[PDB]
Amino acid sequence: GGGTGFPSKTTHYLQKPKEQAQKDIFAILQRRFRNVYGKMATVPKNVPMVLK
RNA sequence: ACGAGAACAUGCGCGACAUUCCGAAGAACGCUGAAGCG
């Protein structure tokens, strides 16, 4: 379904090492959504932040 | 007062008969209405 989350709808997170995948996802989210992740200085413990 | 004088290169006759512009051919191949959450 729709609204399952960022891990879902994205093959790359599973393939990348947890830390590498988290960094790449944070970079992508900051590139797209600058008003939430763009304001965040560092990578959060979990990327994306919220559970869907 | 000419190898001359008359004297239609003419008459009847259909460019016509038989013919399929057809034969073969997927508008389809891939494509999450989804991501962030303020």
Curated annotation (Swiss-Prot):
Encoded in a type III-A CRISPR locus. Part of the Csm effector complex that includes Cas10, Csm2, Csm3, Csm4 and Csm5. CRISPR (clustered regularly interspaced short palindromic repeat) is an adaptive immune system that provides protection against mobile genetic elements (viruses, transposable elements and conjugative plasmids). CRISPR clusters contain spacers, sequences complementary to antecedent mobile elements, and target invading nucleic acids. CRISPR clusters are transcribed and processed into CRISPR RNA (crRNA). Belongs to the CRISPR-associated Csm5 family. This is CRISPR system Cms protein Csm5. It comes from Enterococcus italicus (strain DSM 15952 / CCUG 50447 / LMG 22039 / TP 1.5). The chain holds residues 272 to 323 of 349 of the full protein.
